[PDB]
UniProtKB/Swiss-Prot annotation:
This keratin differs from all other IF proteins in lacking the C-terminal tail domain. The gene is KRT19. The lineage of its organism: Eukaryota, Metazoa, Chordata, Craniata, Vertebrata. It comes from Homo sapiens (Human). This is Keratin, type I cytoskeletal 19. Expressed in a defined zone of basal keratinocytes in the deep outer root sheath of hair follicles. Also observed in sweat gland and mammary gland ductal and secretory cells, bile ducts, gastrointestinal tract, bladder urothelium, oral epithelia, esophagus, ectocervical epithelium (at protein level). Expressed in epidermal basal cells, in nipple epidermis and a defined region of the hair follicle. Also seen in a subset of vascular wall cells in both the veins and artery of human umbilical cord, and in umbilical cord vascular smooth muscle. The chain holds residues 18 to 28 of 400 of the full protein. The modification Asymmetric dimethylarginine is found at residue 7. Belongs to the intermediate filament family. Heterotetramer of two type I and two type II keratins. Interacts with PNN and the actin-binding domain of DMD. Interacts with HCV core protein. There are two types of cytoskeletal and microfibrillar keratin: I (acidic; 40-55 kDa) and II (neutral to basic; 56-70 kDa).
């Protein structure tokens, strides 16, 4: 889940 609880580099 990009842009969720944890910032995701893939997204």
């Amino acid at each position: 889940l990009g842009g969720g609880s944890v910032r995701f580099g893939p997204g």
